[PDB]
Design a protein around this ligand. Structure first.
Ligand SMILES: Nc1nc2c(ncn2[C@@H]2O[C@H](COP(=O)(O)OP(=O)(O)OP(=O)(O)O)[C@@H](O)[C@H]2O)c(=O)[nH]1
Ligand SMILES: [Mg+2]
Ligand SMILES: [Mg+2]
Ligand SMILES: [Mg+2]
Lengths: 178, 40
């Protein structure tokens, strides 16, 4: 059976952990507990080929900045995540996460993931963002980031509703196996 | 055109959390696992 190593990075609370857990065991955590380090494995089939998909969850908080690279060795693929309702997290993809990733694994494919899709049409959320001079990330500005950091794909999803959730991992498995 | 199944056989290999008295985690040799993981 083939081994694939997936590593997720991105700002705190963008939803990296909920993404991994919602996908792997069909449950949405709800409580927020910041990750320090967590490693999981699931079994998949891609055609007839048996697959061990290793999921390496990392800490978004900057307290763990010097520990985070322990997760980066021999990666098959990176997911870099930002929340579509956090332009701050979008910018940090540019100033921090993309630079961090390529510094350690410049040749490893990156998929850009916009998280919390379900929040973009939440009128109450848009209020918050407007009264504070922040903005929603629309799909176009998402594809723009993808092109800017030379990410292979850009996928928007919701761990809460599961909209496009499975797609994120199918595409990652495909990018690696191709 | 590969058909990717949903995942099965979920297992959590390593876990680290921040306690009031430093980091703890499982399995007991988690620190060895982290450092070995960082090695290439
Ligand atoms: N509405 C909505 N909320 C979400 C979604 N995914 C995560 N959240 C919420 O956002 C908070 C952060 O989720 P996490 O998955 O723990 O965030 P993280 O990126 O893993 O954070 P760190 O481990 O600290 O880096 C949690 O309370 C979730 O309930 C989503 O798809 N939709
Ligand atoms: Mg987390
Ligand atoms: Mg730092
Ligand atoms: Mg590399």
């Amino acid at each position: 059976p083939t081994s694939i190593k997936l590593v997720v990075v991105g700002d705190g609370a963008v939803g990296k952990t909920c993404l991994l857990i919602s996908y792997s065991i069909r449950k949405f955590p709800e409580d927020y507990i910041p990750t320090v380090f967590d490693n999981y494995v699931v079994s998949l089939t891609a055609g007839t080929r048996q697959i061990q998909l290793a999921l390496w969850d990392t800490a978004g908080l900057e307290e763990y900045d010097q520990l985070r690279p322990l997760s980066y060795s021999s990666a098959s693929i990176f997911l870099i995540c930002f929340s579509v309702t956090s332009s701050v997290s979008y910018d940090n993809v540019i100033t921090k996460w993309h630079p961090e990733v390529i510094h350690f694994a410049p040749k490893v494919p990156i998929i850009l993931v916009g998280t919390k899709l379900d929040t973009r049409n939440d009128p109450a959320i848009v209020k918050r963002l407007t009264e504070q001079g922040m903005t929603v990330i629309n799909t176009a500005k998402g594809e723009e980031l993808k092109n800017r950091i030379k990410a292979v794909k850009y996928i928007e999803c919701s761990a809460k509703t599961s909209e496009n959730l499975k797609t994120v991992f199918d595409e990652a498995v495909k990018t690696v196996l191709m | 055109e590969l058909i990717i199944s949903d995942p099965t056989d979920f297992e959590q290999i390593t876990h680290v959390e921040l306690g009031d008295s430093g980091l703890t985690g499982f399995p007991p040799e988690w620190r060895e696992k982290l450092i070995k993981a960082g090695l290439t």
